[PDB]
């Protein structure tokens, strides 16, 4: 059974960058629903699979990708943030960012560009391309997860669904992007990067 | 030059169903941006068309559908609402709804179902199918407009992008759907229906 | 385990409308590959689901929909055709057609148009909408199956992938559509209709 | 007005790798139809844009991308091939390849895989990412053009629509891919590369 992970910090720990109301709803309501809905969807698919009902399996795909991706995405997202986040990464991760994007600041502009560019709901990602052996930026629609749909290993995700910023930044998504850099947990992003170090 | 239409009522005229803050931002900020961005996009396409630059024309499609659809959708939406809305339609429109959906209440449940079912950003629509000569319910993603992408003539649209309800109803989209029925301008929906009366 | 069904007739039974080379290749190579790949994909999904590996489940969706859809679609297609087919249907089906499309000829026009309209690979379908309780024509891309993706019940499908007609009709898909009417198994289409209209 | 370019060689010049019947049909019928439909669609767009008819502009997008993309893609494809082609490229291009893909053979493996991987109709491409300043392989569905939809610059395209190989290789797309390497115009691919790498 999939389960809702606890936040690594309190709901108001990312203030004033992301306020407590957004965090509380985002975790206890939005993420929570994806987990429960994912479990329900998985149970329906085992039944469909057991009966060899291909039509049912296909009909369940949107729910599985949506709720499953929702669980995958938010689980990573919480770990990507920290009250003591911000600044820049060091060592290998930093060198890779410099190598692949020119400089840390350029990288921030490129991931900001990808995140602000999402039309409708979605996510901006810094991922790792195993085949090419380098970092790569990508944007995903709705809850479509990065690895499941592109093969890239997620390192840092920026949720740009309106439920992630509208209460506080209203329609000005760039203000939200501006603020989130202050709470990025580069320690976690570095750990995920080193995890694909092969 | 496309322009931002004035609202047919004040920003707080739909209270308590849709609060003033949502309306003020939705119209003066969200719709406004689509109009300006649409004008910019159209100007780029005339240049691309004049030079016969097919690649540029294709690259501009997402911006044109997104901002153009945004303008089309919101323009219709404002006219679909009224402080003195609610209740049920009469005459032909009502008979068609009964004929095509069984009853007015069933119709409300079906359009509610379509609207709540949108994964991510989008719209729920009651449209008119000219070929079949009957009403039809459809859901559209992001700002993809009803007529431009399905051929159905829009009669009533329900915006389910989070910027349309999150500030007030948070993650509970069904509460928003529950409330909006109280401000539907059936007089306008009837006018649009009679407009395809041929 | 899914299996390749035998054709209900000889590979050259549909001559001269659909030649024997196309039929033999379509059944013994094309459909067979979808069956094989479906079995492979389904088993990978069994493992992924057992491990609660959401990323793997999602990554397998394109292969499951494509190959699963391929199996569903071609299985129905073989039964929709017959060496003694052609002409028009009778009874309730014919009544539904004239009623929902005006006449049999207008119906041919609509389904032909939907099939010829597919850009790229896909299928044209005459289906049954259990919700509205009436017939409905739809087009599906690649191997996306009718019921699994639209909820409509398949009654008659027209495969417009190039492998279904290139060898014989070359780029003239309209000639292929005109010819296929001569081999439609209306008896089978009637069964499928009476089956969901109980 | 867009025009159908003459082929840079005889229809049977690529024998036995791609037969003359496929070449003649592909150029004189398939590509020709895209050109004709593109001109028709572009003119309708001129009218729609002049009237500020956003709905019509949006409704025309599928036809413009499909036919416009068709023209762009096939125009490049003819130049990427040659009767005296085959072998490997030299100089900077070859350096970029081994560098970005490991070796020429690994590159063939990657592009072949991308091309054979297309489910339904589409293209496999070796492109140039001006942003990262390196080569990049991508697959595009139907006639969606490489630059217009991904921003990457096309260097070499492999058409994997069934009309490009069914007549000769039947359902065995891998045999088609193996054969096409013998006619790649590396001289042309080099030009396109040096052109965007200025
Ligand atoms: Mn979220
Ligand atoms: Mn809106
Ligand atoms: Mn087929
Ligand atoms: Mn082609």
From Swiss-Prot, chains A, B, C, D:
Protein's name according to its UniProt entry: Superoxide dismutase [Mn], mitochondrial
Gene: SOD2
Job of this protein: Destroys superoxide anion radicals which are normally produced within the cells and which are toxic to biological systems.
Pfam families, A to Z: Sod_Fe_C (PF02777), Sod_Fe_N (PF00081)
PANTHER family per the UniProt record, alphabetical: SUPEROXIDE DISMUTASE 2 (PTHR11404), SUPEROXIDE DISMUTASE [MN], MITOCHONDRIAL (PTHR11404:SF41)
Modified residues (N6-succinyllysine): 44, 51, 98, 106
Cofactor entry: Mn(2+)
GO cellular component: extracellular exosome; mitochondrial matrix; mitochondrial nucleoid; mitochondrion
Gene Ontology terms for molecular function: DNA binding; enzyme binding; identical protein binding; manganese ion binding; oxygen binding; superoxide dismutase activity
Main location: mitochondrion
Its EC number(s): 1.15.1.1
Entry-annotated residues carrying N6-acetyllysine: 44, 51, 90, 98, 106, 178
């Amino acid at each position: 059974k999939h389960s809702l992970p606890d936040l690594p910090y309190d709901y108001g720990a990312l203030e004033p960058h992301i306020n407590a109301q957004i965090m509380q709803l985002h975790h206890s309501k939005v993420h929570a629903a994806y987990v429960n809905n994912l479990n329900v969807t998985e149970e329906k698919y085992q039944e469909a699979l057991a009966k060899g009902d291909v039509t049912a399996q296909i009909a369940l795909q949107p729910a599985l990708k949506f709720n499953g991706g929702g669980h995958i995405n938010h689980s990573i997202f919480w770990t990507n943030l920290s009250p003591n986040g911000g600044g820049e990464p060091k060592g290998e991760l930093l060198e890779a960012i410099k190598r692949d994007f020119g400089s840390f600041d350029k990288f921030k502009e490129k991931l900001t560009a990808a995140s602000v560019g999402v039309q409708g709901s979605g996510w901006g990602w810094l991922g790792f391309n195993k085949e090419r052996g380098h970092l790569q930026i990508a944007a995903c629609p709705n809850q479509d997860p990065l690895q499941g749909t592109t093969g890239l290993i997620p390192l840092l995700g920026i949720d740009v669904w309106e439920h992630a910023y509208y209460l506080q930044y209203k329609n000005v998504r760039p203000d939200y992007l501006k603020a989130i850099w202050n709470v990025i947990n580069w320690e976690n992003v570095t750990e995920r990067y080193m995890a694909c170090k092969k």
